[PDB]
């Protein structure tokens, strides 16, 4: 998770400048091997998010997720479907086996003149006790 | 290094 | 003679601080950058500043200001040679040396500051031997650290025995606006890549003029080295006698020697350029590039950097062979030719416009620098004759070399 | 007479110049560099005014961004700071939670807000409602 | 916060106290006042991890001055660790010992220092040699009270020249800090021992033992030659600081060698290809060289008189580089390269670096005074730059053309016919006053000198001191040359400078010229139209009284300041 | 072509300014190349991105013609971009800005008031003196309109053209007649600032305009009595911006009149009592109120009250108000002069304040506070304060010491004593321009030069490096050398004057590098006078003149040779012109 340090304030700024509330196609980086976000690398990443900081207790959203996931794919080579969580009813538990963060619910001049949402929670047993599997048993066999 | 090498002698007596 | 060597950034905050005498206060660093703002903006920039009696020896990295402070009449070249060495050793440790290299790796870097220098006296700066007891991953110091041979540890062992040499030419050129060659020296540099077993004493011989004059072969092909600067490991007292390049190499990649010589023969590629600068209107560069060098040889991936005006606009390029990219970011054109053999002569006709309003200020005249590279081609004609592998164990190594001729400072002063 | 207006960052990064006096660009780059250096080299209990070279130079920090004016040496000073604050109010009016990053971005209308407030170096609308009304109508004109 | 840190610092588990001390020197790395937690990290110092003890040694050295009384809680731990059989941990303590400056501590640590003076491993002994000078830095007289001077003199008598060179570098340090009471010089036989020790030690050690040679002077020619023949192979080494230390003593020792021997010419011919190669270095190191090279040609101009082309600046060169190359071209301005220099300097006035251009104008003018050969061609070069109609290029030129006319006043009246029309709205008063002299001194071949001064006689009361004084100078010189057309001109300038001017020297020379005109203007042809002698030029050669001292200071700030070493240190 | 904020976001990612310039010239070329395409589409944004680089400080001279195209556009946004950079890229000395003159004149006749508001904006901000001459009838025509959106703009634009063209206001005397009853305040504000401008330039306009003084006395009293409006109100204070401008107009009116000064007297007595001094606003109201009262021939009960207003303002801990109060008494120095002098210790207190401007106003007002009564005591504070100045104030104080001392010196000796004190303690801080003034007053002094030149000699043996000190001394040695070395043609009993170290100390200047060469200009002048002012040891000083004839300074090479022929050929004509210089004023 070395080249994930150089965009650790840079992409998070674009996440935080993204509101939590041309181009066509998909390029693939040549000759770089691709793999999903594996278990021990998610253990390597959940501790990378535990140690580098700036993520815990932040306002999670989907626009921030997609800014983040494609940046992992283009700079680290990982399939950007790993940051998937359980839907609306219930705690937004990760479907990813190894992601130890569950999602609980919680510039300035773009406002007009007179005027006429989630967050992380570290759960180290989400890597072993797949709580999203308890929320979705029939999908995981 | 795409260029290739050339072997020199050892002694040159 | 250092007292407190500091590392700043482009903002002037201390990346890392280390004193060696206590004779310079640690808060003196905060005056340096405003004095650096002072001396530069008045053009009185020097690598030494002074806030009263504290002398500010500094170099400048990409982000970094390796500021070594002192107060007395310190030995100056003692400081700066160490400064580029610390850059070098950090480059040996950290493949890029930036703010991320410092603030993430302060575990080892303070230990380096403890180790490289005591009191202002550098004592151990060979990074390859320094790797053996200063790791970022402690045992006793090696004997090579104690030893007068301080560049090569014993017991180094490989499966094969490969001696990879790189005789590299670097053609300097100064052609004025008159079209005469002002200064064309050649600084060649043989850099060795040693992969050998044990402790060998390598003895090298070239087509030296003086060594052929001592032999009596001063009528055949002999390069005349005006000055060489060698590695430490070359026993220069043995070389001073009879041109004897005898040394125990370190292990791995290192530059052994640095020869320099003048050459009164033509440049390998002559450039003729013109400028039809029409006032408020346009500019035209009908530039050709003839190759004076050998036809068997081919100048690889040449990159002719011709400085264009800043507000030059609407580029047009009638080349012959080779593409132009216009680089307004450097305010220039790179007429790039990949394969350009000797004897070849390729024209390029450039055409810009110019704003009908003039600019406010002048621009000055940068010369044209090209980025040629010719392999297997010694322009000075230097030839390695042999390489004597001398091991007490005794083996037959594999000595190997390739010849590459590039530019040094290939400046050609424009119109 | 306001001779010019400068808005420079906590790092001195100028987010606005408005020269109501005609002096050339080298002099613009000289003088602007000096006063930013003057104000950033000046403490927090230093009376919000500088007597800078026959210009009672008005500064008034509100955020990381700094503020600057050059009033004629016959005019009022606290009102000149209130001119800044009324303009601060109009920036607070047209934006609301008026803030640093769209000063960097939407500066083009902050000039236009200044154009609805100060032309020639003096005030044209002493109301704070009618001016931002007019710029909205020209924004409603687009 | 810090107490939770002190909770982990007063923990018993290693992984908690190890991460705690990393945060402390990371708080010190970010520059936090972590001095309040001083004796608490001292508790987690005596640890089995050698990797961890460096962090505390880092802290204790940094906060020794801050907590001088609390620093008594390490003395036992140092003498504990000067005895552990790892030589790495012993010398680590030793260099931590000498750099910690608390006078309450330094008296106690001399004995483990004396212990490590006679240690076995070369590693700690070259470390302990410097710690003596660290102690002599802190308390100089305690070292002689400990009598550590001779023990340092005996590690000179040791083998493995790294220990010897670290002994020498501390020796030349302490003897410098000494008043030279008991000067630490040795016989040539130790100099024979050091010169044999030269070919073995590191590139740094080779420097420091060339620096003991900066104090010694040989007493014979062969004695000087034989040691210099072993300094001679050092000029082919990659470290220029090795080379620069070698050249410094060779410039020092060549005052003893006989010029009658060919070894003197052999030494100088072996000296020039290194010195040119020093300009092939990095520009900061070249900026070291350019101040040193400046010192050389003032002493020995014979060496590099063949080399001018390497002193040609490039476009990408730094500004401090580009100014200093122009100086050596002045210091090498000879007849053999009058055309190479002036064409190059004409190419240097075509630059936007104004001060480089301003220096280059002076570089032409210093060339015009140094050689009278191209003193015609220097003027012709400058008038081209006058015809560039760039103000500072012109405004630097007019002062120079004056000084050439002050230097070579004879046959350059074919120049002022161009220079009578030179856009007299020149603004800079150094060249405005240059204009008035050139008009004034040459007010016979400028036939309309009266009417051009009328523009210079309009805003007279507020120009300058010099320009008003040059106008007082030139008109009286003009009226003495032509009293016909300038009759009202000489009276109105006395009407302004004597009456309506408060400038007292302008009042002084005003009423003097007014009375001299009133007494005898014909005698004023003898008084003020007097044949001025040849102007004694400013010889910018540094005095050999100072220069021979600065022969001993090459690669030190005294050369890079061209000052005596005391004139800038405090 | 990318947008503005996309560019800025790329610019905000730039670290090195040199790297940022790479990003500049990256986009700048595309801006140039688009300009070669004569684009009208992205010409909005390419200019907007360019003006950012202009605000970033980059050479954007090239796109100025496209701004003229954007002014001569038809879309409102392209005009909205076009009028902006016209105020940015162009000035009067831009010299290409004259093409706006037709374009503005068409757009002063545009249907939209906002387009005409843009035209009055650009001309009001940066309209050139000839552009002001070419648009003068149109501005007053748009000042004859009823559109208060334009009447607020054409008024200040008329100020600009009267500011730029001072000989143009006479066609605006009919324009301004009886629009003083504007219900809007902003138009009424701009009219006041115009009438501030109209009364400022010509005294001939004052007669027409002092008539309507009680008209606005009513309207200003309407502003006090209309204590609230939802607009114009800051902190419960209604339209303070207009109120000060009326007072400033009431300050420049009635300043030598009395009837209008009494026609404005009532509301002055009102608002000096009817102001809320709590917030910053009511202080700003009351500050101009003080300044209005001081400058007119006012009621004496106003001015006594006004110093009591200021005595409050001296004691407020707000350094703003301290800057306000120090500026106030700095204004009314002569007017009500002695009610200032009772606040003297407050001024000496602010010498010890920790603000530059406060110490600046206090030092200069102390320079103004010096009468012939406080001349002895306050200088001892000031000569102490000269020691306790900042080096920026050391140049400022030492001159301002010399200014008030030439006014009100009770002695000529003590006048010398303080100046000699300052010249010893200022040195490199005292200006060289006061040196002919000091030289003049000591030869305006006629009586103490034996007192002077000895004390001149007694300090120059201390140092020479104080250049304005030794500028003063060498003329005194040349002129009054007879009063230094007196009757000592040969050796006598040793008095401190010795006529050889007298000659050596000037010779010490001539070789010392710390000599401004007008030090050496005065010195050879003193050498040649002491060929006559001294009869003791001459023709050893001829040697010094003769060796200096090869000197490297041009005039000092002239000065020595022009002296030396008198020393070699006309020795009797040396003293024939060395009479003392006359004394002037």
Curated annotation (Swiss-Prot), chain B:
Induction: By type I interferons. (Microbial infection) Down-regulated by HIV-1 VPU protein. Antagonizes its function by targeting it to the trans-Golgi network, sequestering it away from virus assembly sites on the cell membrane. VPU also acts as an adapter molecule linking it to BTRC, a substrate recognition subunit of the Skp1/Cullin/F-box protein E3 ubiquitin ligase, inducing its ubiquitination and subsequent proteasomal degradation. Predominantly expressed in liver, lung, heart and placenta. Lower levels in pancreas, kidney, skeletal muscle and brain. Overexpressed in multiple myeloma cells. Highly expressed during B-cell development, from pro-B precursors to plasma cells. Highly expressed on T-cells, monocytes, NK cells and dendritic cells (at protein level). It is found in: Golgi apparatus, trans-Golgi network; Cell membrane; Membrane raft; Cytoplasm. Monoubiquitinated by KSHV E3 ubiquitin-protein ligase K5, leading to its targeting to late endosomes and degradation. The GPI anchor is essential for its antiviral activity. Residues 1-13 are cytoplasmic. It comes from the Eukaryota. Belongs to the tetherin family. This is Bone marrow stromal antigen 2. The lineage of its organism: Eukaryota, Metazoa, Chordata, Craniata, Vertebrata. The chain holds residues 4 to 16 of 180 of the full protein.
From Swiss-Prot, chain C:
Its main location: Golgi. Phosphorylation of membrane-bound AP1M1/AP1M2 increases its affinity for sorting signals. Keywords: Acetylation, Cytoplasmic vesicle, Golgi apparatus, Membrane, Phosphoprotein, Protein transport, Transport. It holds the Pfam family Clat_adaptor_s. Residues 160-413 form the MHD domain. The keyword Protein transport applies. The modification Phosphothreonine is found at residues 144, 146, 215. It is a peripheral membrane protein. The keyword RNA-binding does not apply. The modification N-acetylserine is found at residue 1. GO terms for cellular component: AP-1 adaptor complex; cytosol; early endosome; lysosomal membrane; synapse; trans-Golgi network; trans-Golgi network membrane. It is found in: Golgi apparatus; Cytoplasmic vesicle, Clathrin-coated vesicle membrane. GO terms for biological process: endosome to melanosome transport; intracellular protein transport; melanosome assembly; platelet dense granule organization; vesicle-mediated transport. Belongs to the adaptor complexes medium subunit family. Adaptor protein complex 1 (AP-1) is a heterotetramer composed of two large adaptins (gamma-type subunit AP1G1 and beta-type subunit AP1B1), a medium adaptin (mu-type subunit AP1M1 or AP1M2) and a small adaptin (sigma-type subunit AP1S1 or AP1S2 or AP1S3). Interacts with MARCHF11. This is AP-1 complex subunit mu-1. It comes from Mus musculus (Mouse). The lineage of its organism: Eukaryota, Metazoa, Chordata, Craniata, Vertebrata.
From Swiss-Prot, chain D:
The lineage of its organism: Eukaryota, Metazoa, Chordata, Craniata, Vertebrata. It comes from Homo sapiens (Human). It is a peripheral membrane protein. Adaptor protein complex 1 (AP-1) is a heterotetramer composed of two large adaptins (gamma-type subunit AP1G1 and beta-type subunit AP1B1), a medium adaptin (mu-type subunit AP1M1 or AP1M2) and a small adaptin (sigma-type subunit AP1S1 or AP1S2 or AP1S3). Subunit of clathrin-associated adaptor protein complex 1 that plays a role in protein sorting in the late-Golgi/trans-Golgi network (TGN) and/or endosomes. The AP complexes mediate both the recruitment of clathrin to membranes and the recognition of sorting signals within the cytosolic tails of transmembrane cargo molecules. Involved in TLR3 trafficking. GO terms for molecular function: clathrin adaptor activity. Widely expressed. It is linked to Psoriasis 15, pustular: A form of pustular psoriasis, a life-threatening disease defined by repeated flares of sudden onset consisting of diffuse erythematous skin eruption characterized by rapid coverage with pustules, high-grade fever, asthenia, marked leukocytosis, and elevated serum levels of C-reactive protein. GO terms for biological process: intracellular protein transport; melanosome assembly; platelet dense granule organization; protein targeting; vesicle-mediated transport. It comes from the Eukaryota. Pfam families: Clat_adaptor_s. One of its GO terms (cellular component) is AP-1 adaptor complex. The keyword Transport applies.
From Swiss-Prot, chain F:
GO terms for cellular component: AP-1 adaptor complex; clathrin-coated pit; clathrin-coated vesicle; early endosome; lysosomal membrane; perinuclear region of cytoplasm; presynapse; trans-Golgi network. The keyword Transport applies. It is a peripheral membrane protein. Keywords: Coated pit, Cytoplasm, Cytoplasmic vesicle, Golgi apparatus, Membrane, Protein transport, Transport. One of its GO terms (biological process) is basolateral protein secretion. It is found in: Golgi apparatus; Cytoplasmic vesicle, Clathrin-coated vesicle membrane; Cytoplasm; Cytoplasm, Perinuclear region. Its main location: Golgi. Widely expressed. Belongs to the adaptor complexes large subunit family. Subunit of clathrin-associated adaptor protein complex 1 that plays a role in protein sorting in the late-Golgi/trans-Golgi network (TGN) and/or endosomes. The AP complexes mediate both the recruitment of clathrin to membranes and the recognition of sorting signals within the cytosolic tails of transmembrane cargo molecules. This is AP-1 complex subunit gamma-1. It comes from Mus musculus (Mouse). The gene is Ap1g1. The chain holds residues 4 to 588 of 822 of the full protein.
């Amino acid at each position: 998770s070395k080249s994930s340090v150089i965009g650790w304030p840079a992409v998070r700024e674009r996440m935080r400048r993204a509101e939590p509330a041309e181009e066509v196609g998909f390029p693939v980086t040549p000759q770089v091997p691709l793999r999903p976000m594996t278990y021990k690398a998610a253990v390597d990443l959940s501790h990378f998010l535990k140690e580098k900081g700036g993520l815990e207790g932040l306002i999670h959203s989907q626009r921030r997720q997609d800014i983040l996931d494609l940046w992992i794919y283009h700079t680290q080579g990982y399939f950007p479907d790993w940051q998937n969580y359980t839907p609306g009813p219930g705690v937004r538990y990760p479907l990813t086996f190894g992601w130890c963060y569950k999602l609980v619910p919680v510039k300035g001049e773009n406002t007009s003149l007179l005027h006429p949402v989630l967050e992380w929670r570290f759960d180290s047993r989400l890597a072993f006790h797949h709580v999203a599997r308890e929320l979705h048993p029939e999908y995981f066999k | 290094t795409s260029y290739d090498y050339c072997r020199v002698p050892m002694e040159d007596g | 003679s250092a007292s407190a060597v500091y590392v700043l950034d482009l903002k002037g905050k201390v990346l890392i601080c280390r004193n060696y005498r206590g004779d310079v206060d640690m808060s003196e660093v905060e005056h340096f950058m405003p004095i650096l703002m002072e001396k530069e903006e008045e053009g009185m920039l020097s690598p030494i500043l002074a806030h009263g009696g504290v002398r500010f020896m500094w170099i400048k990295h990409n982000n970094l200001y390796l500021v070594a402070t002192s107060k007395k009449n310190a030995c100056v070249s003692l400081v700066f040679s160490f400064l580029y060495k610390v850059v070098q050793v950090f480059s040996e440790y950290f493949k890029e040396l930036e703010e991320e290299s410092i603030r993430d790796n302060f575990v080892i870097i303070y230990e380096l500051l403890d180790e490289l220098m005591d009191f202002g006296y550098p004592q151990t700066t060979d990074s390859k031997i320094l790797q053996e007891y200063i790791t970022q991953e402690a045992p006793r110091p090696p004997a090579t650290v104690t030893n007068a041979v301080s560049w090569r540890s014993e017991g180094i062992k490989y499966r094969k025995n490969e001696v990879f040499l790189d005789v590299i030419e670097a053609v300097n050129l100064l052609v004025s606006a008159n079209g005469n060659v002002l200064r064309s020296e050649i600084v060649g540099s043989i850099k060795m890549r040693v992969f050998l077993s044990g402790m060998p004493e390598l003895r090298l011989g070239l087509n030296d003029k003086v060594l052929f004059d001592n032999t009596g072969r001063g009528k055949s092909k002999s390069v005349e080295l005006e000055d060489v600067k060698f590695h430490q490991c070359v026993r220069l007292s043995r070389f001073e006698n009879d041109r004897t390049i005898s040394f125990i190499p370190p292990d791995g990649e290192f530059e052994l020697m640095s020869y320099r010589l003048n050459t009164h023969v033509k440049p390998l590629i002559w450039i003729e350029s013109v400028i039809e600068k029409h006032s408020h209107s346009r500019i035209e560069y009908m530039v050709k590039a003839k190759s004076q060098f050998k036809r068997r040889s081919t100048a690889n991936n040449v990159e002719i950097h011709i400085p264009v005006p800043n507000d030059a606009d609407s580029p047009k390029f009638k080349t012959t062979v080779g593409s132009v990219k216009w680089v307004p970011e450097n305010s220039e054109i790179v007429w790039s030719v990949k394969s350009f053999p000797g004897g070849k002569e390729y024209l390029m006709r450039a055409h810009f416009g110019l704003p009908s309003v003039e600019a406010e200020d002048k621009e000055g005249k940068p010369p044209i620098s090209v980025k040629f590279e010719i392999p297997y081609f010694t322009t000075s004609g230097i030839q390695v004759r042999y390489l004597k592998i001398i091991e007490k164990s005794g083996y037959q190594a594999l000595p190997w070399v390739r010849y590459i001729t590039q530019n040094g400072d290939y400046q050609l002063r424009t119109q | 007479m306001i001779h010019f207006i400068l808005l420079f960052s906590r790092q001195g990064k100028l987010r606005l110049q408005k020269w109501y006096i005609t002096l050339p660009d080298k002099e613009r780059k000289k003088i602007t560099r000096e006063i930013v250096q003057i104000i950033l080299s000046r403490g927090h209990r230093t009376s919000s005014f500088v007597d800078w070279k026959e210009l009672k130079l008005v500064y008034k920090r509100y955020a990381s961004l700094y503020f600057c004016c050059a009033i004629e040496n016959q005019d009022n000073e606290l009102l000149t700071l209130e001119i800044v604050h009324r303009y601060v109010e109009l920036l607070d009016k047209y934006f609301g939670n008026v803030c640093e990053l769209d000063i960097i971005f939407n500066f083009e209308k902050a000039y236009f807000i200044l154009d609805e407030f100060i032309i020639g170096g003096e005030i044209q609308e002493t109301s704070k409602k009618i001016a931002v009304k007019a710029i909205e109508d020209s924004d409603m004109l687009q | 916060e810090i107490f939770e840190l002190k909770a982990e610092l007063n923990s018993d588990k290693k992984e908690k106290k190890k991460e705690a001390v990393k945060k402390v020197i990371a708080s010190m790395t970010v520059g936090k006042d972590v001095s309040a937690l001083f004796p608490d990290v001292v508790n987690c110092m005596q640890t089995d991890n050698l990797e961890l003890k460096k962090l505390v040694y880092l802290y204790l050295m940094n906060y020794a001055k801050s907590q001088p009384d609390m620093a008594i809680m390490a003395v036992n731990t140092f003498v504990k660790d000067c005895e552990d059989p790892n030589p790495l941990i012993r010398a680590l303590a030793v260099r931590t010992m000498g750099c910690i400056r608390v006078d309450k501590i330094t008296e106690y640590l001399c004995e483990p220092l004396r212990k490590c003076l006679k240690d076995e491993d070369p590693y700690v002994r070259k470390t302990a040699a410097v710690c003596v000078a660290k102690l002599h830095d802190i308390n100089a007289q305690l070292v002689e009270d400990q009598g550590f001077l001779d023990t340092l003199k005996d590690l000179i008598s040791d083998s493995n020249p790294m220990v010897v060179a670290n002994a020498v570098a501390a020796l030349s340090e302490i003897a410098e800090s000494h008043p030279s009471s008991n000067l630490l010089d040795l016989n040539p036989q130790s100099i024979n021992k050091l010169l044999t020790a030269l070919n073995e030690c590191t590139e740094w050690g080779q420097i420091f033992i060339l620096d003991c040679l900066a104090n010694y002077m040989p007493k014979d020619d062969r004695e000087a030659q034989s040691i210099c023949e072993r300094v001679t192979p050092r000029l082919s080494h990659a470290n220029s600081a090795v080379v620069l230390s070698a050249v410094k003593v060779l410039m020092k020792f060549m005052e003893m060698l006989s010029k009658d021997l060919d070894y003197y010419g052999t030494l100088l011919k072996k000296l020039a290809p290194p010195l040119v190669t020093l300009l092939s270095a990095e520009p900061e190191l070249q900026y070291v060289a350019l101040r040193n090279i400046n010192l050389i040609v003032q002493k020995r101009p014979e060496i590099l008189k063949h080399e001018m082309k390497v002193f040609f600046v490039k476009y990408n060169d730094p500004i401090y580089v580009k100014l200093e190359k122009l100086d050596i071209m002045i210091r090498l301005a000879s007849q053999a390269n009058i055309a190479q220099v002036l064409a190059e300097l004409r190419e240097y006035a075509t630059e936007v670096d104004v001060d480089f251009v301003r220096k280059a104008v002076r570089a032409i003018g210093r060339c015009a005074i140094k050689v009278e050969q191209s003193a015609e061609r220097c003027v012709s070069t400058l008038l081209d730059l006058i015809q560039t109609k760039v103000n500072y290029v012109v405004q630097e030129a007019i002062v120079v053309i004056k000084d050439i006319f002050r230097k070579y006043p004879n046959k350059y009246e074919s120049v002022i016919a161009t220079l009578c029309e030179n856009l007299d709205s020149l603004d800079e008063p150094e060249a405005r006053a240059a204009m008035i002299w050139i008009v004034g001194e040459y007010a016979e071949r400028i036939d309309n000198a009266d009417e051009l001064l009328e523009s210079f006689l309009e805003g007279f009361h507020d120009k300058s001191t010099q320009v008003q004084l040059q106008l007082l100078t030139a008109i009286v010189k003009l009226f003495l040359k032509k009293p016909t057309e300038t009759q009202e001109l000489v009276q109105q300038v006395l009407s302004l400078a004597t009456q309506d001017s408060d400038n007292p020297d302008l009042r002084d020379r005003g009423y003097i010229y007014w009375r001299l005109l009133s007494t005898d203007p014909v005698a004023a042809k003898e008084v003020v139209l007097a044949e001025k002698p040849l102007i004694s030029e400013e010889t910018d050669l540094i005095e050999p009284t100072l220069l021979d001292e600065l022969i001993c200071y090459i690669g030190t700030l005294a050369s890079v300041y061209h000052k005596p070493p005391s004139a800038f240190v405090e | 072509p990318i947008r503005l904020r996309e560019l800025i976001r790329t610019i905000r990612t730039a670290r090195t300014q040199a790297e940022e310039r790479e990003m500049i010239q990256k986009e700048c070329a595309a801006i140039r190349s688009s300009f070669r395409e004569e684009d009208n589409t992205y010409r909005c944004r390419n200019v907007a991105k360019l003006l950012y680089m202009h605000m970033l400080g980059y050479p954007a001279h090239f796109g100025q013609l496209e701004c003229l195209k954007l002014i001569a556009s038809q879309k409102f946004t392209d005009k909205r971009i076009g009028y902006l950079g016209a105020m940015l890229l162009l000035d009067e000395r831009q010299d290409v800005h004259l093409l706006m003159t037709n374009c503005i004149k068409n757009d002063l006749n545009h249907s939209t008031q906002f387009v005409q508001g843009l035209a009055l904006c650009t001309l009001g901000c940066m309209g050139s003196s000839e552009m002001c001459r070419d648009l003068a009838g149109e501005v007053e025509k748009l000042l004859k309109t009823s559109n208060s959106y334009l009447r607020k703009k054409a008024a200040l634009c008329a100020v600009h053209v009267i500011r730029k063209v001072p000989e143009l206001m006479e066609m605006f005397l009919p324009a301004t007649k009886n629009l003083l009853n504007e219900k809007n305040h902003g138009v009424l504000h701009t009219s006041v600032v115009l009438l501030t401008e109209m009364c400022e330039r010509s005294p001939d306009m004052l007669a027409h305009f002092r008539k309507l003084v009680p008209q606005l006395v009513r309207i200003l009293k309407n502003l006090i009595m209309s204590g609230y409006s939802p607009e114009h109100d800051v902190s419960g204070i209604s339209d303070p911006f207009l109120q000060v401008r009326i007072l400033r107009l009431l300050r420049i009116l009635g300043r030598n009149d009395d009837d209008s000064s009494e026609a404005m007297n009532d509301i002055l007595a009102q608002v000096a009592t009817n102001t809320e001094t709590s917030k910053n606003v009511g202080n700003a109201i009351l500050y101009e109120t003080v300044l209005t009262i001081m400058d007119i021939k006012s009621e004496s009960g106003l001015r006594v009250l006004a110093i009591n207003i200021l005595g409050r303002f001296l004691l407020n801990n707000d350094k703003n108000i301290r800057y306000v109060a120090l500026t106030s008494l700095l204004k009314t120095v002569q007017t009500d002069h002695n009610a200032v002098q009772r606040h003297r210790s407050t001024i000496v207190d602010c010498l010890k304040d920790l603000d530059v401007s406060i110490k600046r106003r206090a030092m200069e007002l102390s320079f103004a506070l010096v009468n012939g009564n406080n001349i002895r005591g306050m200088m001892k504070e000031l000569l102490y304060f000269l020691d306790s100045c900042e080096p920026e104030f050391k140049a400022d104080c030492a001159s301002g010491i010399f200014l008030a001392a030439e006014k009100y010196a009770p002695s000529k000796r003590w006048h010398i004593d303080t100046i000699m004190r300052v010249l010893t303690t200022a040195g490199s801080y005292v200006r060289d321009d006061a040196v002919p003034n000091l030289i003049q007053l000591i030869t305006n002094s006629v009586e103490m030069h034996a007192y002077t030149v000895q004390r001149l000699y007694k300090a120059i043996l201390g140092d020479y490096s104080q250049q304005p000190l030794v500028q003063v001394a060498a003329w005194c040695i040349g002129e009054y050398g007879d009063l230094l070395v007196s009757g000592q043609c040969e050796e006598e009993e040793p008095i401190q004057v010795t006529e050889d170290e007298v000659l050596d100390i000037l010779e010490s200047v001539l070789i010392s590098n710390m000599s401004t060469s007008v030090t050496r200009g005065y010195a050879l002048t003193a050498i040649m006078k002491l060929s006559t002012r001294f009869t003791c040891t001459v023709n050893r000083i001829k040697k010094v003149v003769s060796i200096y004839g090869s000197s490297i300074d041009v005039e000092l090479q002239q000065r020595a040779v022009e002296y030396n022929a008198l020393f070699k050929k006309y020795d009797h004509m040396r003293s024939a012109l060395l009479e003392r210089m006359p004394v002037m004023e």
